[PDB]
Amino acid sequence: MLNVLMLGVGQCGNRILDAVNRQAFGGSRLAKSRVETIAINTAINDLKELKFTAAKDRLHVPNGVGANRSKGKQGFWENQEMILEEIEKRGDFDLIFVMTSVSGGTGSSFSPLMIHELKKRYKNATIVPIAVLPFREEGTIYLQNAAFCLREMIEVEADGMILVDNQYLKRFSGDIASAYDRINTMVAQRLLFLIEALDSEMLSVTDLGDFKTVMNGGLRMGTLGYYQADKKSPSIRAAIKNSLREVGLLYPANVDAGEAGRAMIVIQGSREYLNVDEITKEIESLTETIGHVFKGIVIKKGEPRVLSVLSLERAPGLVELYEKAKWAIQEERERKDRARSELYEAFEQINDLEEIYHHH
Ligand SMILES: Nc1nc2c(ncn2[C@@H]2O[C@H](COP(=O)(O)OP(=O)(O)O)[C@@H](O)[C@H]2O)c(=O)[nH]1
Numbered sequence: 442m443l444n445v446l447m448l449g450v451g452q453c454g455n456r457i458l459d460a461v462n463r464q465a466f467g468g469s470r471l472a473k474s475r476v477e478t479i480a481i482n483t484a485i486n487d488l489k490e491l492k493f494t495a496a497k498d499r500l501h502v503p504n505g506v507g508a509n510r511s512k513g514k515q516g517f518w519e520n521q522e523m524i525l526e527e528i529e530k531r532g533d534f535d536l537i538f539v540m541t542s543v544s545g546g547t548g549s550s551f552s553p554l555m556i557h558e559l560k561k562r563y564k565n566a567t568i569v570p571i572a573v574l575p576f577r578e579e580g581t582i583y584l585q586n587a588a589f590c591l592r593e594m595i596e597v598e599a600d601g602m603i604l605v606d607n608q609y610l611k612r613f614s615g616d617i618a619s620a621y622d623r624i625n626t627m628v629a630q631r632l633l634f635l636i637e638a639l640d641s642e643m644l645s646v647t648d649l650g651d652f653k654t655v656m657n658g659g660l661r662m663g664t665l666g667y668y669q670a671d672k673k674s675p676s677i678r679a680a681i682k683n684s685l686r687e688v689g690l691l692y693p694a695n696v697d698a699g700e701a702g703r704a705m706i707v708i709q710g711s712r713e714y715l716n717v718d719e720i721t722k723e724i725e726s727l728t729e730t731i732g733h734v735f736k737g738i739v740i741k742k743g744e745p746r747v748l749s750v751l752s753l754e755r756a757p758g759l760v761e762l763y764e765k766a767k768w769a770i771q772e773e774r775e776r777k778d779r780a781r782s783e784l785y786e787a788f789e790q791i792n793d794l795e796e797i798y799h800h801h
Contacts, residue, residue: 443474443640446534447632450555451548452487453573454541455480455494456621460629462493468633474640477531481524483516483547500527506546508582510589513550524551525558535646536639537566538632539599542573542607543590544583553593560598567649569656570594571628573605574692574762581773584766591759601656601752604664604692604759628691631665634748638707641739651705651735658703658733658752662759664692666749675714675745681706681723684747694753699730703752707737710745 449458458480465476481500482488488499502520506513517524539556541548552570559568572594575583594602605628613619639652656663668683670676684706687693694700704727708720715738727734731751 442643443536443636443646444532444534445474445476445636446528446531446537447476447478448528448537448539448555449478449480450539450541450551451482451545452484452542453545453621454539454548454552454571455482455487455491457540457571457573457625457628459491459494460622460625461632462498464626464629464633466493468637474636474643475532476636477534479527479531481551483513500524506550508544508546508586510546510550510586513546514554516547517551517554521554521558524555525562528559529562534563534566536636536649537563537568538571539568540571540573540628542575543587543594544573544575544579545586549586549590553590553597556594556597556599565646567600567653567656569601569603570599571603571605571632573624573628574607576611577608577765581766581769584762584769588763588766595661599661600653601658602662604662604753604756606692606758609687609693610691627667628665631667631691631748634667634707634709634746635665635750637741638709638737638739638748641741642737652750654733655703655705655735655750655752659754660752660756662756663701663750663752664690664694666690666751667747669746670710670744672744675710677708677714677716677720677745677747678723680708680745680747681720681727681749684749685727685751689749690751693758694751694756696730696751700753700755700757701731701751702754703733704731705735705737705750707739707748707750708745709739709741709743709748711742712740714745715740 449455458478478498479500480494483502483506485501506516539552541552543549556568575587610624611620612623666684666689668680668689670680683689685696724734724736
């Protein structure tokens with residue numbers, strides 16, 4: 442009943458979309474809503490490396506952006522109609538995910554621009570960016586791009602934003618390909634669960650209302666939490682708590698500290714595991730630390746799993762990111778003053794030397 446569009450923009454966005462398509466193939470098999478996916482990139486090598494995305498869903502936008510957001514923005518304007526045309530060919534959508542890193546040149550610049558245009562064309566749509574944050578010790582440009590991208594995302598007034606923190610989720614040491622795969626798999630798993638949840642309880646598109654209410658609360662930024670219980674311990678209470686603890690989140694929000702203002706908790710699993718009274722009692726507990734909590738139960742054969750959609754009131758982790766971008770930009774300037782300073786100093790040294798020379 443739900444028309445969903447997923448747009449993976451830039452390399453990171455492309456790879457997340459590919460993980461979505463990967464996992465979606467498995468979901469399709471079990472089945473015995475329309476979900477469109479477009480991977481958008483200015484680098485054709487990236488689109489070539491995709492493995493589970495149909496050729497028709499790979500959109501090359503000609504023309505080198507690198508990590509230059511200015512060039513990215515220019516690139517978008519030059520190809521804006523072509524990009525939007527590709528989207529409009531696929532009909533109407535009720536729900537749009539725009540997936541990108543905030544640190545590159547293509548994803549981070551196209552995405553806020555694209556959302557602006559999409560909001561005009563699909564006024565009734567729920568449009569949700571999935572914003573992937575850089576590794577802590579990624580370079581200066583990555584941090585700077587991140588800071589300005591996040592600003593534009595808020596400015597463009599989408600329906601909230603799901604934060605994905607590469608640093609917190611970072612695994613496999615120097616094996617960045619494995620790190621990306623773990624992260625991308627977690628994002629895709631959560632998004633697919635989210636879409637399933639929204640689609641199964643749906644009688645009308647206005648049923649996206651509660652989700653929008655959460656996403657538009659507080660800072661208008663949030664994240665997804667997740668926990669799959671095992672057969673041994675199917676406790677819903679534990680399952681609910683574990684999806685709300687940092688280790689369960691895509692971004693390390695501290696729920697116990699009251700950083701989350703709103704939440705949607707979805708419990709999915711075999712009917713025999715689902716005690717409505719118990720679930721209700723657990724949700725009531727959350728209102729201690731979380732202002733408004735909505736809940737959904739989805740019956741589907743399996744050991745229970747929980748998805749949490751959190752909305753943030755506070756995000757100290759993002760402030761830390763901003764300060765590091767700031768510290769970075771500044772250090773480059775001081776490095777340029779010390780060079781001018783030693784050069785001025787050298788000239789004064791030479792003057793004394795020449796003056797000593799002319800006196801002999
Ligand atoms: N989680 C995740 N992060 C990625 C992936 N690829 C790149 N990144 C991160 O995304 C940022 C680079 O942006 P990228 O999408 O590669 O640049 P773009 O193609 O110009 O938009 C850096 O912070 C990378 O660490 C990926 O597959 N998964």
